[PDB]
DNA sequence: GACTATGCACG
DNA sequence: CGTGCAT
DNA sequence: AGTCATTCATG
DNA sequence: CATGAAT
């Protein structure tokens, strides 16, 4: 009827439970594909549903309900918020979801509700899912035990660094800024070739973070420190220009701001400086950003010290902020603070896993087929005796048994022969089949070599990473300064 | 709720009355902040022909319009001190969109006649096909996505088609016959149900 | 540039639009299946997605998102609210959706949000959809032009009357009360035999409404009027009992209340009578209903006139109310005030079209099959000669020509022969095929007769209606008094 | 927020703290109204060992509990002026339910110790599987299979039979076994400082 | 995840 | 007022 | 259909 | 103070 537990024990089995889950299955990204579980399910469900960059947009509510019912047993609003986020290109260096409609602004006004919006996987998102149908990655049972879901994605690009993550669980938090796709891949390629590469050298390829919001990142040293240990504090500062206006008045013009910074709040807080006269000099503050440009104009009074003003805003507003690296991720089911090296190496180990898996799978298909084709060719040699045998067999089973026993076909071949349609009997061309037999024998040799030879395999993985870079490469947005 | 235009100017500034918060956002984003303001209407608007003038003054949607348009209401209404030269009604191009226009129009008629009488009240025509507004213009672009509402378009999409003063079209509501309009608004919006039922039976072809 | 337009003309056009749509496709039920468009789409969608009484509950949000993305372009909340209602057995005489979880209550407390609840079609909703896969009902394109939806369902029971409807559009409104399934079916069966039946005779089968909530209905005369003209006013009174209590005190107990009446509000309003002392003798009001029984206890004071109290409560609260029939429905695309006869007859006309369509569809399957089977029976006698004839042909098309030219098989028979799998040559059993032929000839004769004779078809309707009554009949809940 | 029991009775009245308005509905309907009250907590309870007593006093969820409990808070707390014999915490059988139980316990410990020291605080044990079973053990015998994701999934008639009915249910009765060994644990798991919590997690939680 | 206001007909 | 699909 | 408050780590 | 997945 009733049962006693101590306050000591009760607070253990409970916080233990929550702690574990929040760490493995909520707040922290997997080190390999760079996704938290909610994002993985969004991409996987959308992809299962054929909701891809090359097909019509699909109503958000439909995507969200499917995710909720099949994969992610939580609130629809959180799922949607996460979906929306992956579509905001001022928060993701490479957006994974393409969303038609009001998905928000840098001003942080609310996205249209899911009843109003439509969405689909972006083309690049496709590459995160590349080869998932080829048994390349481990699956688990969903919460319902009704369907299998992937525990990680194949990740044909290094999403963790490219898009970043953030980042608050229990006992742990995470902050990993986004990077330039091209730079990240260059490092990965160099590291495939030189596994023991040091950070200094890696940084000739991957010099630092690249925010979608651009701006200026300052502190080569703290960057080095973060790539080394996973923690570091760099400075991010707005891109500014001065503009002389008529009558001795100057004007400060902002064109880029720091990552994760809300434009409307920034502008307001700058205007608060003017209203409070915390510092003398400010005439007016204007947000002049339009549908195709970000432009904040801070007009100064005549004979006003524009150095003092700009310096004050840098210190007391978010015109300039500190950005703290705190690269934590899930490696081998546990949280790890990691620098650039573990990250790149975990990635490479993962691709290896995938490419091997991908290749075993394709090779198995080629084999099962080649095996059938070999039988068909043979059968043609003895058609009449084979039709007679089937004609004398009591049923499907008996016919297969007779095929094995009298002419040494295997089960798999027997089953293919016995389920041929009558019209096939009209064919007697062995050549076309022999051409297929040759094409398959070649494909199997290539695939077998990838699996048997570490270097052939690593070439493949370099070849593919370069194809991705050539396709999705965009220029740096953030400038680096020491 | 109101998103102001940057500068004040009773001669250029326009007031878009958008149906819904969500499209109010797409519109906040799409607009030209220097002269276009946005005011979202949350929910169906109160029928100012049916409800008591008390429940009316007390309605939050109505009060905030009387203030932002800024000229008072009804018999104490001075066109002179208004804030906008163009009040633009912008709804989904669906049936509930039509209803909202209806409701608003009978409010400007009843409580701000001078505004509608000077041709200051327009209606924005959003496109229905993706660009072409009329089925006719449709088949003509197939020689060379059916929009269910405003929320379907992106901000750059909104501006180009319906908010950009150069590229847009607007149904400008002029009162042609004072008598034949008073009767039309009443049969349709007033207390009495029978006449309305009859009007529908006469004018609406259920094919 | 702009385009001027009169107020007179604009207001006309616009309101004409909202008016029409609200009348045909939002507020009022179709006279045949008794559904509003949203209700139809909920059912069609759930059924297309295999979400039926005999299979697991599916999470509501998944049901709703699919409905919204494929058929109903409106708020998710409206869709969910409609779905919820269809599952409430205090608003529906025969619930069409089964919902697991907090789906509301007679106290009108809110149902759990769509993220929490699970649902599926009830077994009876099944009968509303029966035969929909058989080309028995007119389909239209959805707002996408991606998918066809049904404009009406095949309705294998008269849902308009059984579950009722209500009901507010433009210029029209509707209130139709629920009815006992058996009674409604008894009436319809009578009317099939006696098309010209008068209300008086119908009312021996269908005496009046049967509310889910039970209680007492007073007014044979107004019922007749309602059944005749679609309008009428009846009285609905709660089921009561007096319990004797210790110390000479008595107790009024309410066990059934009137349709569409919120039990919680009723109890406050009654307690208001006591608090205000509007009638002498009420000691205390308690709601004692629990998960398996409704119960309101009105404990009276010692020397209290229990009649004075009971009568007062009936008059000045909602322990007794008026119910007004205002039976309006959509009939040939237009709104119509209607009594029992137009309803029942419209239903019968609909079932006729549905059964005729069904029967045409099944006949055509059976002929096509009969035709194949006739050829197969022939092929058996010439098996070897056919195999040889195929062996001798250069390919598929050639094999068919040879079969046609040499043995006078038709195209469709040649196609079927030539595409048999080899193992079929072991299943060389003519008698089993002759049984199938016989069974098909019989089936085709029955269906021909349905198609060619109105009375034979009407008998099929009566037979089917009786099976539904046998299967779903339940006792009256509402008692009648005149 | 509170749905009260019909008759006021300190010796028998029960107070259900339910995680959520929706589940709080299933509880109103499922309950015996004579002596069982329902009080929905809307959202994660405030960590009373991390926030300032200022912000803790201004918390609606917290204030209505002191009010519905009726013994006031802190040192100005009489257990003799309480309104319930049993205060039952009823959360989903998921990780966030776990968390919520943890947050309420630290409140009832830091601010109503007497209530916890008198064995007056309990925790419902909702079922994990459905014949009904709690844990792997009871499923093996039932085999001789719906998995509950939350209180939301149970119809009000099941809720009663399985977890609200005094005659049919199981409750963990919370008890302070060692006041010292227990102060450390709440302070370490729920305290302001991260480093000790992180360590505790490292040492106790088995990631596998 | 509950709450807040409207339209529409009708007693 | 309160109903049920809408916004 | 926007809005309100809380966890958790962090500077 | 915010951040972003959670209730
Ligand atoms: N001046 C009025 C605002 C909106 N109110 C409600 N809105 C609801 C709803 C309920 C409301 F009280 C809904 O219930 C709803 C829905 O889709 O279910 C949508 N909405 C809804 C909300 C916002 C909007 F712009 C349009 C809507 F239809 C109250 C005050
Ligand atoms: N004392 C606080 C209640 C709840 N507050 C909010 N609740 C939100 C939310 C936001 C809130 F402010 C959500 O945003 C949300 C969601 O799923 O997105 C769920 N909820 C949510 C609401 C109720 C509940 F019981 C549990 C929840 F998680 C305000 C006052
Ligand atoms: Mg939320
Ligand atoms: Mg700063
Ligand atoms: Mg719309
Ligand atoms: Mg609503
Ligand atoms: Mg009465
Ligand atoms: Mg839960």
Tab-separated table of C-alpha atoms in Angstrom, chain A residues 278-444:
chain	number	residue	atom	x	y	z
A	278	UNK	CA	25.394	58.343	-20.268
A	279	UNK	CA	27.946	59.706	-22.660
A	280	UNK	CA	27.681	63.028	-24.492
A	281	UNK	CA	27.540	63.241	-28.284
A	282	UNK	CA	24.645	61.170	-29.690
A	283	UNK	CA	22.124	63.007	-31.868
A	284	UNK	CA	19.857	60.208	-33.080
A	285	UNK	CA	19.763	56.427	-33.606
A	286	UNK	CA	18.106	54.933	-36.716
A	287	UNK	CA	17.539	51.344	-37.766
A	288	UNK	CA	17.645	51.601	-41.556
A	289	UNK	CA	17.884	47.896	-42.334
A	290	UNK	CA	15.609	46.820	-45.181
A	291	UNK	CA	14.662	43.515	-46.818
A	292	UNK	CA	18.146	43.512	-48.418
A	293	UNK	CA	20.669	45.121	-46.092
A	294	UNK	CA	21.538	45.731	-42.449
A	295	UNK	CA	22.164	49.392	-41.602
A	296	UNK	CA	22.244	51.135	-38.249
A	297	UNK	CA	23.029	54.857	-38.375
A	298	UNK	CA	24.166	56.618	-35.202
A	299	UNK	CA	24.228	60.319	-36.057
A	300	UNK	CA	26.414	62.454	-33.801
A	301	UNK	CA	26.120	66.111	-32.865
A	302	UNK	CA	28.472	68.739	-34.305
A	303	UNK	CA	31.823	68.828	-32.490
A	304	UNK	CA	31.238	65.467	-30.780
A	305	UNK	CA	34.079	63.068	-29.936
A	306	UNK	CA	33.305	60.108	-32.200
A	307	UNK	CA	36.131	57.970	-30.807
A	308	UNK	CA	34.830	58.292	-27.215
A	309	UNK	CA	31.275	57.447	-28.312
A	310	UNK	CA	32.138	54.406	-30.431
A	311	UNK	CA	34.430	53.167	-27.656
A	312	UNK	CA	31.706	53.580	-25.033
A	313	UNK	CA	29.149	51.652	-27.083
A	314	UNK	CA	31.706	48.874	-27.591
A	315	UNK	CA	32.109	48.525	-23.800
A	316	UNK	CA	28.558	49.129	-22.562
A	317	UNK	CA	26.442	47.618	-25.310
A	318	UNK	CA	26.506	44.457	-27.343
A	319	UNK	CA	27.935	46.375	-30.267
A	320	UNK	CA	30.870	44.313	-29.032
A	321	UNK	CA	30.677	41.154	-26.946
A	322	UNK	CA	32.866	38.380	-25.633
A	323	UNK	CA	32.219	34.984	-27.196
A	324	UNK	CA	33.113	31.994	-25.012
A	325	UNK	CA	34.044	28.711	-26.618
A	326	UNK	CA	32.917	25.825	-24.434
A	327	UNK	CA	33.066	22.959	-26.914
A	328	UNK	CA	31.306	20.028	-25.264
A	329	UNK	CA	29.829	17.131	-27.215
A	330	UNK	CA	28.684	13.531	-26.825
A	331	UNK	CA	31.424	11.011	-27.589
A	332	UNK	CA	30.884	7.343	-26.833
A	333	UNK	CA	27.603	8.127	-25.004
A	334	UNK	CA	29.294	10.531	-22.601
A	335	UNK	CA	29.979	14.294	-22.468
A	336	UNK	CA	33.495	15.389	-23.501
A	337	UNK	CA	35.056	18.816	-23.609
A	338	UNK	CA	36.866	18.628	-26.929
A	339	UNK	CA	39.147	20.762	-29.059
A	340	UNK	CA	39.495	20.846	-32.839
A	341	UNK	CA	41.499	17.570	-32.943
A	342	UNK	CA	39.096	15.089	-31.226
A	343	UNK	CA	36.295	16.697	-33.265
A	344	UNK	CA	37.991	16.204	-36.643
A	345	UNK	CA	39.198	12.770	-35.688
A	346	UNK	CA	35.787	11.623	-34.389
A	347	UNK	CA	34.389	12.845	-37.685
A	348	UNK	CA	36.907	10.955	-39.791
A	349	UNK	CA	36.438	7.768	-37.758
A	350	UNK	CA	32.690	8.164	-38.392
A	351	UNK	CA	32.954	8.649	-42.169
A	352	UNK	CA	35.201	5.591	-42.256
A	353	UNK	CA	32.479	3.683	-40.440
A	354	UNK	CA	29.877	4.921	-42.924
A	355	UNK	CA	31.838	4.391	-46.124
A	356	UNK	CA	32.731	0.858	-45.037
A	357	UNK	CA	29.061	0.197	-44.164
A	358	UNK	CA	27.859	1.846	-47.388
A	359	UNK	CA	30.232	-0.352	-49.367
A	360	UNK	CA	29.397	-3.646	-47.657
A	361	UNK	CA	25.777	-2.852	-48.475
A	362	UNK	CA	26.264	-2.021	-52.150
A	363	UNK	CA	28.543	-5.040	-52.489
A	364	UNK	CA	25.916	-7.341	-51.001
A	365	UNK	CA	23.402	-6.163	-53.646
A	366	UNK	CA	25.861	-6.580	-56.490
A	367	UNK	CA	26.662	-10.100	-55.185
A	368	UNK	CA	23.037	-11.311	-54.769
A	369	UNK	CA	22.408	-10.103	-58.282
A	370	UNK	CA	25.541	-11.513	-59.906
A	371	UNK	CA	24.627	-14.781	-58.215
A	372	UNK	CA	21.169	-14.756	-59.859
A	373	UNK	CA	22.565	-13.671	-63.223
A	374	UNK	CA	25.030	-16.585	-63.139
A	375	UNK	CA	22.105	-18.977	-62.717
A	376	UNK	CA	20.042	-17.362	-65.501
A	377	UNK	CA	22.919	-17.703	-67.935
A	378	UNK	CA	23.200	-21.375	-66.976
A	379	UNK	CA	19.460	-21.982	-67.189
A	380	UNK	CA	19.478	-20.793	-70.808
A	381	UNK	CA	21.887	-23.659	-71.559
A	382	UNK	CA	19.314	-26.140	-70.286
A	383	UNK	CA	15.938	-24.413	-70.825
A	384	UNK	CA	13.985	-27.400	-72.093
A	385	UNK	CA	15.204	-29.696	-69.324
A	386	UNK	CA	14.359	-26.966	-66.755
A	387	UNK	CA	10.818	-26.377	-68.085
A	388	UNK	CA	10.310	-30.149	-68.089
A	389	UNK	CA	11.495	-30.327	-64.506
A	390	UNK	CA	9.109	-27.584	-63.419
A	391	UNK	CA	6.337	-29.212	-65.437
A	392	UNK	CA	7.045	-32.401	-63.432
A	393	UNK	CA	7.203	-30.681	-60.061
A	394	UNK	CA	4.201	-30.828	-57.683
A	395	UNK	CA	4.451	-27.171	-56.624
A	396	UNK	CA	6.789	-24.228	-56.050
A	397	UNK	CA	8.692	-25.847	-53.182
A	398	UNK	CA	9.120	-29.175	-55.003
A	399	UNK	CA	10.280	-27.316	-58.128
A	400	UNK	CA	12.975	-25.519	-56.206
A	401	UNK	CA	14.006	-28.722	-54.472
A	402	UNK	CA	14.217	-30.355	-57.907
A	403	UNK	CA	16.289	-27.490	-59.270
A	404	UNK	CA	18.796	-27.700	-56.412
A	405	UNK	CA	19.010	-31.474	-56.467
A	406	UNK	CA	19.048	-32.147	-60.192
A	407	UNK	CA	21.000	-29.112	-61.526
A	408	UNK	CA	22.775	-27.699	-58.446
A	409	UNK	CA	21.158	-24.294	-58.277
A	410	UNK	CA	21.176	-22.554	-54.926
A	411	UNK	CA	17.953	-21.680	-53.119
A	412	UNK	CA	18.329	-18.020	-54.063
A	413	UNK	CA	18.785	-18.968	-57.743
A	414	UNK	CA	16.023	-21.547	-57.674
A	415	UNK	CA	13.635	-18.928	-56.315
A	416	UNK	CA	14.607	-16.497	-59.070
A	417	UNK	CA	14.183	-19.129	-61.788
A	418	UNK	CA	10.824	-20.316	-60.550
A	419	UNK	CA	9.352	-16.812	-60.277
A	420	UNK	CA	10.314	-15.853	-63.836
A	421	UNK	CA	7.349	-14.830	-65.992
A	422	UNK	CA	6.463	-17.095	-68.899
A	423	UNK	CA	7.490	-14.598	-71.538
A	424	UNK	CA	11.093	-14.764	-70.347
A	425	UNK	CA	11.075	-18.189	-71.988
A	426	UNK	CA	11.262	-16.368	-75.334
A	427	UNK	CA	14.752	-15.050	-74.602
A	428	UNK	CA	17.928	-16.895	-75.558
A	429	UNK	CA	20.488	-14.081	-75.555
A	430	UNK	CA	23.253	-14.847	-73.118
A	431	UNK	CA	25.278	-11.797	-74.220
A	432	UNK	CA	23.327	-8.997	-72.615
A	433	UNK	CA	23.429	-10.960	-69.343
A	434	UNK	CA	27.203	-11.520	-69.674
A	435	UNK	CA	27.559	-7.730	-69.996
A	436	UNK	CA	25.692	-7.334	-66.699
A	437	UNK	CA	27.923	-10.064	-65.164
A	438	UNK	CA	31.022	-8.108	-66.152
A	439	UNK	CA	29.719	-4.749	-64.898
A	440	UNK	CA	28.860	-6.381	-61.523
A	441	UNK	CA	32.199	-8.149	-61.225
A	442	UNK	CA	33.918	-4.793	-61.697
A	443	UNK	CA	31.705	-3.023	-59.159
A	444	UNK	CA	32.361	-5.728	-56.579
